[PDB]
Design an enzyme around this catalytic site. Structure first.
Site, PDB file in Angstrom:
ATOM      1  N   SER A  45       1.086  -0.942   0.069  1.00 30.66           N
ATOM      2  CA  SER A  45       0.437   0.009  -0.210  1.00 30.66           C
ATOM      3  C   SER A  45       0.788   1.333  -0.010  1.00 30.66           C
ATOM      4  O   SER A  45       1.231   1.921   1.011  1.00 30.66           O
ATOM      5  CB  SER A  45      -0.801  -0.363   1.227  1.00 30.66           C
ATOM      6  OG  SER A  45      -0.326   0.367   1.944  1.00 30.66           O
ATOM      7  N   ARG A  46       1.092   1.615  -1.091  1.00 30.62           N
ATOM      8  CA  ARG A  46       2.219   2.774  -1.340  1.00 30.62           C
ATOM      9  C   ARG A  46       1.549   4.203  -1.491  1.00 30.62           C
ATOM     10  O   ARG A  46       2.525   5.033  -1.478  1.00 30.62           O
ATOM     11  CB  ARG A  46       3.292   2.400  -2.511  1.00 30.62           C
ATOM     12  CG  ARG A  46       3.582   1.514  -2.500  1.00 30.62           C
ATOM     13  CD  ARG A  46       4.037   0.637  -1.320  1.00 30.62           C
ATOM     14  NE  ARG A  46       5.052  -0.457  -1.693  1.00 30.62           N
ATOM     15  CZ  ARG A  46       5.385  -1.287  -0.929  1.00 30.62           C
ATOM     16  NH1 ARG A  46       5.598  -1.169   0.685  1.00 30.62           N
ATOM     17  NH2 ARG A  46       6.614  -1.928  -0.733  1.00 30.62           N
ATOM     18  N   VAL A  47       0.857   4.343  -1.083  1.00 26.52           N
ATOM     19  CA  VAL A  47       0.126   5.805  -0.765  1.00 26.52           C
ATOM     20  C   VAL A  47       0.343   5.954   0.316  1.00 26.52           C
ATOM     21  O   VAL A  47      -0.142   7.076   1.736  1.00 26.52           O
ATOM     22  CB  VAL A  47      -1.232   6.136  -1.354  1.00 26.52           C
ATOM     23  CG1 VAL A  47      -2.205   7.646  -1.342  1.00 26.52           C
ATOM     24  CG2 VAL A  47      -1.699   5.548  -3.031  1.00 26.52           C
TER      25      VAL A  47
END
Lengths: 105, 177, 104, 52, 140, 277, 52, 140, 52
Positions: free
Chosen positions: E6-8
């Site tokens: 989950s890169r946000v």
């Protein structure tokens, strides 16, 4: 199986009892509904099944619940068609099953 | 004279310097034995421990009070606090005695040792018991051995060993109790 | 099925070279540094040809697999092999001389 | 809540939810019909409810 | 944890977690790699076993029982006391008692500080190193 | 294109039953050697409690013997002692000694030729064809004895159990050149042992170290045989798990391909029919 | 692949326990006493939990 | 035999054949699991190879000969001969030579009794226990 | 997988014979002479029966 659900619903709601039901081989109820929905000219869904598979199986399995009057516990034998749990008939069956009981040889 | 300080415990630190550090040190046969030589004691009376051995079997490891070894200067008996010994044995019979019971084993030629702790290490190749040998074909075996006499020193040594082995088998089969 | 034990020594050489050049195509990106903390590395074309020609011929066969993982180029490979070796022994000794006494 | 069917294995290991659905992965000759008849007999004897 | 990305939310989260959580990610990735490299236990290197101990410790730390929310201040401490030492005394087993033990046996004043501050200040890092060694741990 | 994944399932399933058979073979043959290894362990303790244990000696000529297996289904065994060969041959070299590397087993010449070929002279093969016998050990010992080194090193894996295989160096020294020389501590610790030989001590120690080499080489090529059966057991139960997980993945892919093909050819019929009427 | 007497004492007590538990999961069923003779035994739940 | 099943089962099987087919399919079910091990014939286990050679006895017993319909008495006689062990001296590839060396050899007295009887009585069982001993089977 | 070392010299005989059978079921045709190099053979039946 809707006749079975009707006699079980009379034993549940009016007689107030704790009723058992036995849907014999729910895959054949799936197959009969697939035959009546291929018969009427509806476009068949995935692998060969009816397009109304999920809702016309949930019309059966959702009258099988507890009530404030009584209960209906149903014991349905489940047969897996190619012995594959990715097949849509056991995939749509097993989202309603609560407890599985493997019988062995 | 002894300018190489070797050893198994010194080999660990000299192994740690040249080999890469990712491997465990290899083991040595000193780690797989506990009955040593200069460990003083190991007699505890008249029963001295006997390590009777063989390459393919172990016939006795229990404690005895007398062992008679067929040494090349003659048969000699081993007691509890025996002398430290390196004895080359003649082909003959070893005598295992624990007391009132006596069992005799014919040996084929091989060394035998006594260490300073009173323990013995009998080390012979074929230790044949006298119940599985025959008294019938031994005379035919000597008749074969007393016949072929060529000029080769190799055959002379093997044939003389044959004569001595078969004659020892005859002497250790005719006078049995 | 069998593992690297069944293969011959030239095939172990091929597998070792292949794992090194298979990890060596990886790099940390300059846009991927917003979720990783690793600083991104631009790799010049001459440095690509130098590093990949070297790992094909065998100038860097001594280095392990992890020295080629998430690296810029062949200078940073040996720079990471310096870092990779160094922490394998120096892992300890932080019990005292810390700020975590009460009075400072 | 739990449905006491009386068998030790299907009340102990994989319990029967009272009001829920049950899956039998049977076969031939493994005694599935005897299991059905014993379930009916036990529930009608104890819990006062019929079967269909 | 390998496929879950989950890169946000990373570099958008609670930073007091994010100090130890990157180290936690590296230890979980190392445990994934060495558990794939040892699907069966035959080769012992005595330093990879530190990884195979730490990862089975952290896997036991992170898992929880159902319907049990854990706030971020009682989570940063429980991952702080496992990414570091303070828990290698148990083998693998009683971490199910050790997490609730270290949650109970710390001062609940530090939870307000770690919640309101947002991150592990050195003024609170020295307290966090100080409290974590007087723990009556049920594992021995 | 759906015929490839079914025949691949057919191949991987019978490979799985092959390794499920050979794990039985290897774990069976580990036990029939287990009634002999502890018996062949009988003669390895008296010589080491008599001669001591002196591996790190500055020999002038030395025959290191790395005994390996025959069939290459080892699993962490042959290359292990191949690296242990140079790892225990490199700490011993300090002044440039003569080195005669000897490998027993067909999987020795395939691996030891790569790293040390210039010091490689003898490769003894087919040694586990029927079983291990002591006269075979005497013959290979005599073929080492044709040359006259100053020491011997015997690299072999000690079968302790079915999980632990620690390789061992068994040491055999030259009798008058180095064996009696290494016992010189305040005189000689061998002279307390009174000799009962025909001739002098100098030629009974020759007989003793030849017997020591033959016994320990017999023990080495029995323990390597039993640990080879144990390591083939530990390798054939990883190939069985590997051909179990590969078969599971290919069965999942066969089910997905089956569903995709039946859905596509059903869509074909419906698109052919509704575009007609 | 190793032998019956091979395993340790920490496990073979559980081998005996599983081999007496797995036969204990069986039950005589009252609907089968018409051709088995032995009458069935309806088991409660708390007795099953305690006796297991 | 591993796939082809009858959902009726042995409840309508011919009795006498029911006495022998239950052991026949039990040894064959052990055989199909010990199948694909016959290629490692040099490696025995001395009991898995016994059930392997008995599965090779029975699998080459049940061969037919292209519109050769057999009455039930000769079928169950050949099955009892192969099942209890009366053809263990017979090798693997001459049982189809050894079947007629039972069926053409014993008298038609036992066959009519077995057909009109309906089940192998222990008197008839002991009769053919000795009657199978005096026949010319291909042994060596 | 292995390569014909583990058939205990009973199945190795039929492997060698089956290789001979697979090589012997080749036949250079009278029309296929222009394909490889070889003139054609019209083989009678008794030759085939006694050869196999």
């Amino acid at each position: 199986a809707l006749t079975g659900l009707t006699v079980a619903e009379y034993f549940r709601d009016i007689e107030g009892q704790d009723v058992l039901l036995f849907v014999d081989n729910i895959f054949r109820f799936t197959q009969a509904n697939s035959e009546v929905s291929a018969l009427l000219g509806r476009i068949p869904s995935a692998v060969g099944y009816q397009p109304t598979l999920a809702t016309d199986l949930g019309g059966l399995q959702e009258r099988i619940t507890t009530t404030t009057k009584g209960s209906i516990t149903s014991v349905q034998a489940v047969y897996v068609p190619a012995d594959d749990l990715t097949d849509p008939a056991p995939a749509t069956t097993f989202a309603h099953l609560d407890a599985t009981t493997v019988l062995s040889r | 004279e002894a300018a190489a300080p070797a050893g198994p415990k010194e080999f660990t630190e000299v192994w740690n310097k040249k080999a890469p550090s990712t491997l465990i040190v290899p083991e040595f046969p000193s780690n797989y034995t506990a009955v040593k030589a200069v460990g003083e004691g190991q007699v505890h009376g008249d029963a001295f421990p006997v390590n009777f051995y063989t390459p393919h079997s172990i016939l006795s490891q229990a404690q005895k009070d007398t062992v008679v070894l067929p040494g090349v200067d003659g048969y000699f008996g081993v007691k509890a606090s025996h002398v430290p010994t390196i004895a080359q044995l003649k082909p003959g019979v070893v005598e295992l005695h624990s007391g009132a019971e006596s069992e005799k084993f014919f040996v084929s030629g091989g060394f035998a040792f006594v260490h300073p702790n009173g323990v013995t290490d009998i080390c012979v190749l074929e230790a044949a018991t006298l119940d599985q040998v025959d008294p019938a074909a031994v005379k035919s075996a000597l008749a074969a051995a007393s016949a072929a006499q060529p000029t080769d020193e190799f055959e002379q040594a093997a044939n003389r060993a044959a004569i001595e082995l078969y004659s020892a088998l005859e002497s250790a089969v005719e006078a049995k109790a | 099925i069998l593992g690297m034990d069944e293969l011959s020594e030239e095939d172990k050489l091929t597998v070792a070279r292949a794992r090194k050049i298979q990890r060596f195509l990886s790099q940390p990106f300059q846009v991927a540094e917003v979720f990783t903390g690793t600083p991104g590395k631009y790799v010049d074309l001459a440095d690509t040809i130098s590093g990949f020609q070297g790992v094909l011929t065998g100038k860097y066969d001594d280095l392990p697999e992890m020295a080629f993982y998430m690296v810029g180029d062949i200078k940073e490979v040996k720079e990471k092999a310096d870092k990779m070796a160094k922490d394998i022994a120096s892992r300890k000794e932080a019990d005292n001389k810390k700020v975590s006494e009460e009075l400072k | 809540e739990i449905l006491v069917t009386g068998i030790k294995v299907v009340d102990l290991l994989a319990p029967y939810q009272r009001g829920g659905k049950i899956g039998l992965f049977g076969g031939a000759g493994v005694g599935k019909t005897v299991l059905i008849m014993e379930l009916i007999n036990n529930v009608a004897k104890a819990h006062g409810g019929f079967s269909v | 944890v390998g496929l879950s990305v989950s890169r946000v939310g990373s570099a958008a989260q609670f930073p007091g977690m994010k100090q130890v959580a990157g180290t936690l990610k590296l230890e979980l990735a190392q445990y994934r790699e060495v558990a794939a490299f040892a699907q069966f236990g035959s080769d012992l290197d005595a330093a990879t076993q530190y990884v195979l101990e730490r990862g089975a410790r952290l896997t036991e730390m992170l898992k929880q029982k159902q319907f049990a929310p854990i706030p971020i201040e009682r989570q940063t401490v429980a991952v702080y006391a496992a990414t570091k030492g303070f828990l290698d005394k148990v083998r693998v087993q009683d971490i199910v008692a050790a997490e609730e033990a270290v949650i109970s046996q710390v001062n609940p004043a530090v939870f307000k500080i770690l919640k309101a501050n947002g991150k592990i200040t050195p003024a609170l890092d020295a307290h966090l190193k100080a409290e974590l060694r007087k723990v009556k741990l049920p594992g021995a | 294109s759906n015929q490839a994944v079914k025949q691949r399932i057919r191949a991987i399933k019978n490979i799985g039953k092959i390794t499920k058979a050979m794990k039985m073979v290897a774990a069976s043959k580990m036990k029939n050697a287990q009634i002999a290894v502890e018996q062949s362990r009988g003669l390895v303790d008296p010589f080491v409690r008599l001669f001591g244990d002196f591996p790190a000696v500055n020999s002038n000529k030395s025959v290191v013997v790395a005994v390996t297996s025959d069939k290459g289904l080892c699993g962490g065994l042959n290359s292990n002692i191949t690296k242990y060969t140079r790892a225990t041959l490199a700490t011993t070299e300090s002044e440039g000694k003569d080195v005669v590397v000897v490998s027993i087993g067909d999987k020795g010449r395939s691996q030891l030729t790569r790293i040390e070929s210039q010091r490689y002279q003898l490769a003894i093969a087919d040694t586990y064809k029927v079983r291990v016998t002591f006269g075979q050990a005497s013959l290979i010992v005599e073929e080492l004895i044709k040359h006259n080194p100053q020491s011997y090193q015997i690299l072999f894996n000690k079968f302790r159990s079915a999980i632990s295989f620690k390789p061992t160096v068994a040491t055999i020294l030259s009798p008058d050149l180095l064996e009696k020389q290494l016992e010189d501590v305040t005189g000689n610790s061998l002279d307390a042992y009174d000799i009962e030989a025909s001739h002098e001590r100098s030629d009974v120690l020759r007989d003793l170290t030849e017997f020591h080499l033959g016994v320990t080489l017999y023990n080495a090529m029995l323990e390597n045989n039993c640990s080879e059966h144990a390591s083939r057991m530990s390798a054939m139960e990883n190939s069985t798990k590997s051909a179990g997980e590969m078969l599971g993945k290919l069965t999942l892919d066969y089910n997905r391909k089956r569903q995709a093909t039946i859905t596509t050819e059903l869509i074909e019929i419906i698109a052919g029919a509704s575009a007609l009427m």
